[PDB]
Amino acid sequence: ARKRRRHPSG
Amino acid sequence: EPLESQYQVGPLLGSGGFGSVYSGIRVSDNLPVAIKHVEKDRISDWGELPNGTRVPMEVVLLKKVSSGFSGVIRLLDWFERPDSFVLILERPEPVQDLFDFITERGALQEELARSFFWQVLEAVRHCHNCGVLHRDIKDENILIDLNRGELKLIDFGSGALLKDTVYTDFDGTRVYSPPEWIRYHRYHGRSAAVWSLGILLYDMVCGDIPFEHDEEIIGGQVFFRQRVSSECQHLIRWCLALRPSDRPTFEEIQNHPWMQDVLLPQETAEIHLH
Numbered sequence: 437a438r439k440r441r442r443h444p445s446g
Numbered sequence: 447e448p449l450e451s452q453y454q455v456g457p458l459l460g461s462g463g464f465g466s467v468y469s470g471i472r473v474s475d476n477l478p479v480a481i482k483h484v485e486k487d488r489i490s491d492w493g494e495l496p497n498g499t500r501v502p503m504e505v506v507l508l509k510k511v512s513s514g515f516s517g518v519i520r521l522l523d524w525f526e527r528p529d530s531f532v533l534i535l536e537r538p539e540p541v542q543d544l545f546d547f548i549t550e551r552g553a554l555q556e557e558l559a560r561s562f563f564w565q566v567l568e569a570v571r572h573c574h575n576c577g578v579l580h581r582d583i584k585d586e587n588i589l590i591d592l593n594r595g596e597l598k599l600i601d602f603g604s605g606a607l608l609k610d611t612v613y614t615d616f617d618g619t620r621v622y623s624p625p626e627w628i629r630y631h632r633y634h635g636r637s638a639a640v641w642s643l644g645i646l647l648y649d650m651v652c653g654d655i656p657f658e659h660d661e662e663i664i665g666g667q668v669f670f671r672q673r674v675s676s677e678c679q680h681l682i683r684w685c686l687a688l689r690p691s692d693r694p695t696f697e698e699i700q701n702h703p704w705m706q707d708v709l710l711p712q713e714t715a716e717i718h719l720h
């Protein structure tokens with residue numbers, strides 16, 4: 437249900 | 447000798463802050479490789495090899511950690527082009543990154559989280575023993591060799607030579623960065639690494655990272671969204687101490703009661719991955 441996402445470096 | 451003929455270039459695997467990474471085969475022996483391209487104009491951190499050749503810091507750090515066997519993806523070769531560097535890296539097959547693994551499987555069983563976390567600790571200790579600070583430990587930067595049950599660290603593009611003095615620069619992932627970086631733009635290498643490992647362990651046993659916002663990182667409150675043993679909660683809360691001096695050493699992490707009786711890599715593959 438809850439949004440899991442990648443996170444860019446920088 | 448030229449890159450063109452020494453490797454067969456396959457399709458893209460991914461791109462981002464790191465560069466552009468293609469599947470590849472070494473023709474001399476059909477070894478599976480990853481071919482990583484970095485544009486010179488995009489590289490901010492430069493170093494020198496023993497012979498004083500000017501190279502991306504990434505090549506300096508990879509060469510320091512790539513001697514012998516470890517939980518790090520090894521640099522097999524590199525080439526300079528007019529506008530870029532090309533890095534030839536190991537490619538396990540079959541492989542999945544730990545980010546995709548956790549997305550697909552959800553929160554990992556503690557036995558599996560213990561095996562994965564232990565292997566990441568051994569890999570990070572290897573880097574520190576070689577004088578290298580990764581500075582971007584996260585699930586996205588960990589490959590799983592699904593047949594061997596072996597984890598491999600990737601992307602040293604945000605890394606530095608390990609020092610005992612303060613760091614005032616950072617280009618890693620903000621949601622894995624410590625509160626002292628958020629608040630004061632200062633951190634020490636080892637204690638910042640331990641913070642990122644707390645974030646990673648929470649990620650493994652809860653199925654996502656604990657913090658998205660700066661206020662959460664500095665707030666010092668860890669809410670468990672999944673069932674997690676008291677010993678595992680204790681280790682996570684200790685790694686995520688707000689004061690860097692209150693965080694465990696790598697020795698204290700690996701001596702923690704939660705970390706005892708780890709599976710071997712092959713047991714991990716047989717029980718959880720096969």
Ligand SMILES: NC(=O)c1cc2c(-c3ccc(C(=O)NCc4cccc(N)c4)s3)cccc2s1
Nearest residue numbers: 459460461462464467480535536537543600601
């Ligand atoms: N970067 C690096 O230094 C390296 C990456 C690799 C890789 C891979 C690139 C991405 C991979 C992936 O599983 N996700 C694909 C994927 C999906 C979605 C987004 C992104 N960025 C990637 S596998 C394999 C072997 C050696 C290296 S060294």
